[PDB]
């Protein structure tokens, strides 16, 4: 569903399977984080369900030794001098040596200013050790981290739990239609996007001969050329688009190893899983109460948050003792306004909109013969209708989806393809729709702040700054301090600084906070891009200094003051809010938990073979399960009749089912529940298990 999910599906470590241990077999000792995991396996990226601690992901710098042992590199230090020699050590090898801090006060010669430096010893103990005693030091920060969890800015400020959660939702982002690069990110994004494989990389340098939406032909330096066939609207394994747009020009020379066309969640060759949105951390009339979020309808209008969803439907035309199944239009008893968008070959015309219940592929099948009702025999003489000896086993578009039609991939034995035995024709139709943002869709940042969309309210009804720019998103303040995810407001401040730009006035000497701050950072342009490594990043003082210099956009207006808050006017009442509220830009991504795929309702569907209970799941008609714990609450209220109906006539009793249906079509009073059939089936199993079981009237 995004390049990140593909990346983390590989380079991940599981504990289940043949020869491994199951969830019930897994004790509390396995799920922990052993101190030996440092640098080998990341202690963040982990599923949060029942598989917590079993399935993990490899670190960014880790390597597999030839024997199967996980091996990591580390710098070696001698007499307070760190060489550039990079050695690779296994887990047990680190016991004999002493590894040092990833971020240590190096003096450009290897010596550390103070002797005692925080180092990790053999048995996982972290103690101070004189500089002359340590022999190894870490390659770099973010060595004990994974690729997915290396994209979270201000990681060191977030709690382990929220960082874990955010790393988890990183894999669940969906590809938008624009995929804007984040304003604030980490340097890992570019490498991850390049190595994901779905961003085409010019293998050999040279100038570009010609560029087009469907193909690109690069003119190499030596005679021959190379053409890169592009993939457009390719269906993914999770029903997400895989658009691939080129980002080169007609005659600009390219270099081997350069990005050529962006992937589903990439722009300019770096990761882009979401968008940059204005943020208000204030509570708003309880529509954002308890982790809810309210978005602006501008995102609906501007298509800021919208994702294409490609759906594939299959139909099999096999061989049967009825003869064969023909893909034609001769479907019995059909109208015209439903058949208008279906071609004369038995399929939909390319580019015809359909919704639930519409006919998709006409697979006529010989009906056979059963008890033809006498009423049918009478009926055929009133309108002249023919027998229609074939059952209309066509394709009905299931409930809760619609959209346009992409294309037809038709296979047939007449086409001389390797179809399965007995199968004569295989037709796969593709349906796509543009899913707008709506209430119930799950949104989340990169710090683990989740939540559904409480309300999509118009642009007038939002706080707006003195510039008149409406806010984009609103988050609840209660969720920040109670969840230890303070990093999100830091990211918000940095995002606002990047959006506005700054010019540190280093005229009368460099400011003290900016002294350690590197060059080319004291000056910045509006809507610039900055990066922040997870553990070696911008400090608090640097952020304060950036907030101090916040040059305005077009007029003279410093909307965000030094402390970080800003003044907002209510869009409903119009009076200014009595206190300033912090504003900024935070990265927000759509999650693959849309409300459309999670809405389900059932009046009367199918039932299982053994017991007459309904089925389960959205694939069939489903029907909610009423577990025995809910029955306990049923009993606690004492609502005996409701429980009786639920367990007898809404679930089990066949005669009760048909009778109650007849009752609420005839407007008649609902009759008494009968004897459940599942109880009789249990009775029969007991009777057939050589247990004499008999129910006694008196």
């Amino acid at each position: 569903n995004n390049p990140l999910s593909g990346l983390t599906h590989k380079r991940r470590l599981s504990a289940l399977g043949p020869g491994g241990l199951s969830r019930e077999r897994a004790g509390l000792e396995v799920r922990d984080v052993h101190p030996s995991h440092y640098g080998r396996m990341c202690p963040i990226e982990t599923p949060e369900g029942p598989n917590i601690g079993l399935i993990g992901s490899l670190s960014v710098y880790a390597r597999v030794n030839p024997f199967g042992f996980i091996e990591t590199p580390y710098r070696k230090v001698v007499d307070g001098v760190v060489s550039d020699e990079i050695v690779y050590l296994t887990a047990d090898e680190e016991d004999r040596h002493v590894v040092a801090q990833a971020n240590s006060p190096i003096d450009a010669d290897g010596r550390f200013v103070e002797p005692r430096v925080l180092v990790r010893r053999k048995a996982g103990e972290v103690e101070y050790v004189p500089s002359s005693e340590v022999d190894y030091m870490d390659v770099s920060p973010r060595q004990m981290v994974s690729v997915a969890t290396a994209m979270i800015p201000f990681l060191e400020h977030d709690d382990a739990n929220r960082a874990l959660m955010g790393a988890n939702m990183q894999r669940q982002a969906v590809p938008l239609v624009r995929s804007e690069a984040p304003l604030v990110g980490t340097g890992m994004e570019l490498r991850a996007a390049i190595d994901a494989g779905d961003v085409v990389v010019a293998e050999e340098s040279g100038v570009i001969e010609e560029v087009s939406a469907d193909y690109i032909t690069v003119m190499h330096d030596n005679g021959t050329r190379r053409t890169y066939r592009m993939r457009k609207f390719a269906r993914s394994n999770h029903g997400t688009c895989a658009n691939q747009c080129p980002i080169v020009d007609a005659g600009d020379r390219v270099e081997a190893g350069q990005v050529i066309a962006d992937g589903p969640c990439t722009d300019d060759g770096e990761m882009a899983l979401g968008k940059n949105l204005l943020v208000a951390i204030m509570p708003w009339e309880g529509h954002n109460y308890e982790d809810a979020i309210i978005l602006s309808n501008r995102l609906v209008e501007e298509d800021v948050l919208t994702s294409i969803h490609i759906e594939e439907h299959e139909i099999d035309a096999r061989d049967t003792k009825l003869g064969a199944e023909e893909i034609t239009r001769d479907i019995p008893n059909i109208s015209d306004e439903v058949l208008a968008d279906l071609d004369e070959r038995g399929i939909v015309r390319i580019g015809a909109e359909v919704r639930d219940g519409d006919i998709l592929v006409g697979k006529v099948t010989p009906k056979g013969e059963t008890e033809l009702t006498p009423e049918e025999r009478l009926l055929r003489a009133i309108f002249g209708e023919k027998a229609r000896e074939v059952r209309d086993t066509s394709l009905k578009v299931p409930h809760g989806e619609s959209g346009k039609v992409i294309g037809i991939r038709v296979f047939s034995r007449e086409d001389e393809d390797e179809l399965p035995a007995g199968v004569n024709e295989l037709v796969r139709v593709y349906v796509a729709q543009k899913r707008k943002i709506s209430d119930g869709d799950k949104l989340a940042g990169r710090h683990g702040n989740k939540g559904v969309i409480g309300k999509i309210l118009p642009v007038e009804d939002m706080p707006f700054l003195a510039d008149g720019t409406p806010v984009d998103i609103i988050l609840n303040t209660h969720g920040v301090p109670r969840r230890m995810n303070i990093g999100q407001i830091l990211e918000t401040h940095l995002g606002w600084c990047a959006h506005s730009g700054w010019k540190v006035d280093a005229a009368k000497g460099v400011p003290d906070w900016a002294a350690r701050l590197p060059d080319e950072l004291l000056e910045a342009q509006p809507n610039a891009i900055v990066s922040t490594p997870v553990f070696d990043g911008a400090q608090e003082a640097e952020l304060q200094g950036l907030l101090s210099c916040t040059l305005p956009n077009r007029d003279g207006d410093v909307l965000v003051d030094a402390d970080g808050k800003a003044m907002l006017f209510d869009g409903r009442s119009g009076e200014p809010f009595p206190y300033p509220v912090t504003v900024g830009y935070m990265y927000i991504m759509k999650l693959h938990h849309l409300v459309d795929d999670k809405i389900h309702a059932r009046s009367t569907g199918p039932y299982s073979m053994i017991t007459q209970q309904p089925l389960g799941g959205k694939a069939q008609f489903g029907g909610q399960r009423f577990g025995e714990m809910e029955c306990w609450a049923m009993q606690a209220y004492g609502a005996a009749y409701t429980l009786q109906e639920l367990l007898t006539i809404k679930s089990d009793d066949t005669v009760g089912r048909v009778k109650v249906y007849e009752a609420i079509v005839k407007g008649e009073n609902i009759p008494e529940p009968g004897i459940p059939e599942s109880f009789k089936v249990l009775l029969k199993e007991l009777q057939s298990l050589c247990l004499n079981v008999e129910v006694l009237s008196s």
């Binding site: 990079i86 390659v139 570019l190 910045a524 891009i529 990066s531 990043g537």
Partner: peptide
């Protein structure tokens, strides 16, 4: 950067990585 098509991402890094990932 060190990547031909890399957009300029100014970073607050304080130290240089001895090796790339």
């Amino acid at each position: 950067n060190s990547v031909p098509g890399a957009p300029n991402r100014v970073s607050f890094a304080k130290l240089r990585e001895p090796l790339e990932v």
